[PDB]
Amino acid sequence: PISPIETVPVKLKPGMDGPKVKQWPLTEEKIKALVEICTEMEKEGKISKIGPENPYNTPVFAIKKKDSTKWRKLVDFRELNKRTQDFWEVQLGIPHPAGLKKNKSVTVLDVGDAYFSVPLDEDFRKYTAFTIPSINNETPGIRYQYNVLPQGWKGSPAIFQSSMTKILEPFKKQNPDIVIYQYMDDLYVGSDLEIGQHRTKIEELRQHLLRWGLTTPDKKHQKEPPFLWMGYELHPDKWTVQPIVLPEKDSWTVNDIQKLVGKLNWASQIYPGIKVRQLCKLLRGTKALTEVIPLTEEAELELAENREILKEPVHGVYYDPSKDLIAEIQKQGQGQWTYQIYQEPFKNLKTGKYARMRGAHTNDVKQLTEAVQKITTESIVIWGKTPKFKLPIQKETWETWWTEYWQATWIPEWEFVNTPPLVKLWYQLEKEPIVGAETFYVDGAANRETKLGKAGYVTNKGRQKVVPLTNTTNQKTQLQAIYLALQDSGLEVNIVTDSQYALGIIQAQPDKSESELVNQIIEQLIKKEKVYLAWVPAHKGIGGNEQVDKLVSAGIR
Amino acid sequence: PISPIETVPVKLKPGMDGPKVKQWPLTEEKIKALVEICTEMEKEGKISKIGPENPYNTPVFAIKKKDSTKWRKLVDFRELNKRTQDFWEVQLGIPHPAGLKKNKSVTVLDVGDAYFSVPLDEDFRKYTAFTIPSINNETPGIRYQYNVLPQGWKGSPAIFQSSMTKILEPFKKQNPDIVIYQYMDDLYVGSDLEIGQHRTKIEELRQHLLRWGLTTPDKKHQKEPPFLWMGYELHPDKWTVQPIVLPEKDSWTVNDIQKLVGKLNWASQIYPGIKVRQLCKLLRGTKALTEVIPLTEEAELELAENREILKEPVHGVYYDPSKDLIAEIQKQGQGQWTYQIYQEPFKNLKTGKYARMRGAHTNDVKQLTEAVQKITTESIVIWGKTPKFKLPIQKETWETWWTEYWQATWIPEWEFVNTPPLVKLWY
Ligand SMILES: C[C@H](Sc1nc(N)cc(Cl)n1)c1cc2ccoc2cn1
């Protein structure tokens, strides 16, 4: 049929005219097929004969259906879609199974010939005009226009889902207990009723839809879970991902590692512990898709654990609105974080992992906070409320980091949970100068045209070194000079730098970086017992600064 | 509300199209609050559902009045206000009295509900489309557009300007020394009267409003008085600038003086006249940071004279009505926050502070949102425009929590910066 529902008014983008593409010559076979197809559509209202100078035209084709059983009419709307107004998005998101409440019965029904069952705004039909050519373009040709939603048109998905929402409203109101989800052609219907009263209510729905131009399956329902939707396997009782299977082959091409990494990332939302760090490292560097990549030891091991984790099936439970959400985060290898979300201890609703670097220079406390934000945001989308956290960090450690960090930091209600590795700061810069500690006035200059710079220091105890460097930035010499002061230094040391750049990095207590130097400066800082860092303006003849500035700048600087 | 009227025709700034801003995910309780509210506004014809043919979107949120268990709808019209600037800024701009900032008291009254009396040009309604999202994307999500003037759009005060003049007229004529100013949704009323007489004149002004259907209980509905005094009153004439402070210790270590020389050096690119030449004192050579040091005579003078310049209006800086106002906030610790307002870096038009003040809560985001409202409010009083904020926080953490503590009906521009180790130099 053609739903009696009102139509959605539509226009063409501002200051544009309908499409007018020439119809390319078609062979006899393709022509006869198109006629046989259009004629049929013409009998059901889908299309109508036109003619009288409808300047508009869209090219058509016809191709052999699967296995080559029947022809299919292909309408290339590229030109029209461009001249068509923009619409609201059909979906700005996708339900996550874990956010689904537990239901007793669930069946899915697909609307047959969806688009063709919905009228097209009369004032727009004139633009969907196309023509069936006559043999070797001798005579005119048959001309039609659409009366319903065309297959490849820009507005079919939007208008259809919106038409369906209106058609479904009345039924929903009279059935608060029935849950309905629209996904393209499909309509998902669930409830906590009995398979008997459920199928009763189902039929009642088919009828409601039929009174509206929409036909649905009889007992071809395709219902009866498990359902396979968007890579998931939904049961009324639980959920998991489609079955994952790892290749197990001798050599691996880039293409194979990518498919593998994709599968693992997908599995990581219910299967805890999944790691792809070592596997992802191998894809680094522009490599051809067919290139074989030797697996390294780590990779082997990582792939190994993953196979282990995947052997026994795991499922996720559904959401109970009456209980709290508990999220627990564990620290895996450096930078790698994993988490589980449940309501009743260990019956996971969802799983996940966070690794994202987020700028060079960072520390477990900042990463843990970032992981907490991802999870917080995610929870709001899926369940509409934040979870209570369980983190591997002492209330004290957290308290001392938040209170002294320049950035504003909050964190939802949490509790400590002793699950090594625990998170901690690996060193603390002193707030005041260390008395009876050698002071190092470090500095560093560098020639821009040459690149040869000298890094060095001068102490109040008379000591003074100055090593040269090749191919270094003014910034590196400053990071190099601090590195020195820490090396030839005792457990306690006062360092005076004139480099704000260095001050910023070090001052944030980073326990990992991308600069090769910064990682070494971190090792030193850890071995110390007291380190005091202070800053002064460069080139202002400050006491000690100029002293070093001299035997550092001398010779290109 | 008030009778119809030829809808003032509006138009976007050509070369620009309506807003298409994504809706930030909301918590269940806020979503519910919103459908109730929107269901009522619908029954009253304020808004109407719309179809997919409308490609526009402006985000919406829900805040609490003044802890009042009554939710309020907040629409983020920042984008729309930007593509409509021509309209409300030049075409129908509203003047800003310079006297307001000098008043002893300024009471802020919410007059937003008044906008729902007037209808919006039908050809402009499509641009005000917003969307009520749903949990876990389980359903399409209710879409709407306004039929009357919306509350967070700068177009609304502009248009209503005509009515507001008729309404206040009798009150203005009878009280020539009371300053009234309108800034999108709110009315700023100021007088040099004594608190008792002021509060009394505000009551009188509400009676006038009331006759045009503008019941305006202020301070954002006071249903539970914690420290609530009256109806939300500001005291501008007592807003003082925050100077750049120089220590006054009894002992000066090499470190203490090095730090002193640093803050001063920086304070040279701002506050012309500052000098520290006679101050590079004993920091000549290579002494231990510890080693305490005496004090020169030139120094005492240096220090003394510099702090005179600082703690004063940076000679040469003037507000430029055309350029945007920028506000920067630094986290000082212990519930302390410093901020500066300027148009051109380090050329402060104003600096200040904000503290827990024997209250507030251990949430940084909490304090920070409170600081932003305080600063934006002062900015509206003094200049008539809001500043763009450089917030020292993670975009995600902010976007997730700000509405949780927000109470104003406007939203300022904000970008997330990363604070340099300047801090030590408060300003
Ligand atoms: C209407 C049903 S409610 C439902 N509840 C369960 N416990 C299990 C299943 Cl299978 N369905 C539904 C199905 C889907 C599929 C994707 O997103 C959806 C949103 N809602």
Tab-separated table of C-alpha atoms in Angstrom, chain A residues 8-9 85-88 93-96 99-101 162 165 169 181 358 370 373 376-377 380-382 384 386 402 405-410 412 433-435 439 441 459-460 494 496 500 507 532 536-537 540-544 547, chain B residues 20 25-28 49 52-57 131 135-140 143 255 258 261-262 265-266 280 283-290 331 337 356 362-365 368 392-394 396-397 400-401 405 418-421:
chain	number	residue	atom	x	y	z
A	8	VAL	CA	6.638	15.848	4.613
A	9	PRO	CA	7.094	19.098	2.682
A	85	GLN	CA	17.729	20.444	1.070
A	86	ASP	CA	19.526	19.091	4.121
A	87	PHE	CA	17.617	17.064	6.724
A	88	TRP	CA	17.883	16.210	10.399
A	93	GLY	CA	23.713	7.582	18.210
A	94	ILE	CA	23.160	3.860	18.607
A	95	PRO	CA	21.794	2.056	21.649
A	96	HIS	CA	24.391	0.116	23.524
A	99	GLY	CA	21.716	0.171	28.507
A	100	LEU	CA	18.826	-2.105	27.649
A	101	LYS	CA	16.510	-3.060	30.509
A	162	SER	CA	9.730	10.266	10.996
A	165	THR	CA	7.364	7.597	14.584
A	169	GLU	CA	2.737	7.093	18.592
A	181	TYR	CA	12.973	0.371	18.662
A	358	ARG	CA	46.857	12.850	25.451
A	370	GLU	CA	41.049	11.116	31.997
A	373	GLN	CA	35.957	11.255	32.342
A	376	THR	CA	31.610	9.202	33.144
A	377	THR	CA	30.535	10.543	29.733
A	380	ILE	CA	25.573	9.279	30.923
A	381	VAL	CA	24.839	8.311	27.293
A	382	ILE	CA	24.058	4.659	28.040
A	384	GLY	CA	21.779	8.520	32.020
A	386	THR	CA	27.190	8.593	36.607
A	402	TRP	CA	44.450	17.860	43.064
A	405	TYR	CA	47.902	21.150	40.309
A	406	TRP	CA	47.123	24.335	38.339
A	407	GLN	CA	44.304	22.743	36.324
A	408	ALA	CA	40.838	22.444	37.857
A	409	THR	CA	39.976	18.810	38.590
A	410	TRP	CA	36.835	17.160	39.931
A	412	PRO	CA	32.584	11.821	40.951
A	433	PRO	CA	65.103	25.737	48.642
A	434	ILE	CA	67.125	22.910	50.169
A	435	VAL	CA	69.579	24.314	52.711
A	439	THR	CA	72.919	25.130	43.771
A	441	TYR	CA	72.704	27.514	37.760
A	459	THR	CA	77.492	25.956	41.053
A	460	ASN	CA	77.970	28.061	44.183
A	494	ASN	CA	68.694	23.163	44.053
A	496	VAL	CA	67.961	27.369	38.942
A	500	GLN	CA	59.903	28.331	31.486
A	507	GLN	CA	56.642	20.940	37.420
A	532	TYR	CA	64.114	22.244	44.238
A	536	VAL	CA	64.769	33.467	36.610
A	537	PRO	CA	64.631	35.663	33.462
A	540	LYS	CA	69.123	40.051	32.848
A	541	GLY	CA	72.508	39.654	34.501
A	542	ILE	CA	70.956	37.716	37.358
A	543	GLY	CA	73.350	36.414	39.987
A	544	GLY	CA	74.646	33.168	38.565
A	547	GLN	CA	77.942	33.455	34.833
B	20	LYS	CA	23.575	23.061	13.541
B	25	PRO	CA	24.190	14.118	26.351
B	26	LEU	CA	21.973	14.733	29.375
B	27	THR	CA	21.311	12.772	32.573
B	28	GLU	CA	17.948	11.099	32.976
B	49	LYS	CA	7.018	19.844	17.183
B	52	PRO	CA	13.024	16.148	9.637
B	53	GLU	CA	12.642	18.889	7.015
B	54	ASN	CA	14.180	21.246	9.598
B	55	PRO	CA	17.970	20.705	9.485
B	56	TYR	CA	18.744	23.020	12.397
B	57	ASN	CA	19.671	22.524	16.023
B	131	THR	CA	16.230	18.621	20.454
B	135	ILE	CA	18.784	7.877	27.045
B	136	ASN	CA	20.921	5.393	25.117
B	137	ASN	CA	19.494	6.661	21.822
B	138	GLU	CA	16.510	4.337	22.271
B	139	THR	CA	14.115	6.737	20.471
B	140	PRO	CA	14.514	9.537	17.888
B	143	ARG	CA	12.221	18.081	18.241
B	255	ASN	CA	65.688	32.865	46.387
B	258	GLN	CA	65.299	36.219	42.669
B	261	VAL	CA	63.081	40.287	40.506
B	262	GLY	CA	61.126	37.853	38.355
B	265	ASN	CA	60.516	41.963	35.375
B	266	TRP	CA	57.218	40.521	34.157
B	280	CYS	CA	69.407	43.345	41.046
B	283	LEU	CA	71.968	38.647	43.295
B	284	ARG	CA	75.300	39.239	41.583
B	285	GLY	CA	77.703	36.319	41.493
B	286	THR	CA	76.830	32.724	42.390
B	287	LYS	CA	75.416	32.376	45.916
B	288	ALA	CA	73.404	29.552	47.439
B	289	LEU	CA	69.655	30.130	47.140
B	290	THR	CA	69.484	29.712	50.922
B	331	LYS	CA	43.707	28.277	40.053
B	337	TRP	CA	41.041	31.962	42.132
B	356	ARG	CA	35.444	29.792	48.944
B	362	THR	CA	35.617	20.969	47.491
B	363	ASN	CA	34.673	20.754	43.802
B	364	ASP	CA	37.024	22.799	41.619
B	365	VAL	CA	34.442	22.765	38.833
B	368	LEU	CA	35.114	27.694	38.850
B	392	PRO	CA	42.025	26.181	33.220
B	393	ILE	CA	40.236	22.834	32.934
B	394	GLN	CA	39.663	19.829	30.666
B	396	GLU	CA	35.322	17.188	28.795
B	397	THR	CA	35.190	17.658	32.561
B	400	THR	CA	30.030	17.295	31.702
B	401	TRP	CA	29.551	19.259	34.908
B	405	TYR	CA	26.103	24.364	39.304
B	418	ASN	CA	46.517	25.542	29.752
B	419	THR	CA	47.891	27.795	32.514
B	420	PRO	CA	51.615	28.665	32.303
B	421	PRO	CA	53.644	28.674	35.532
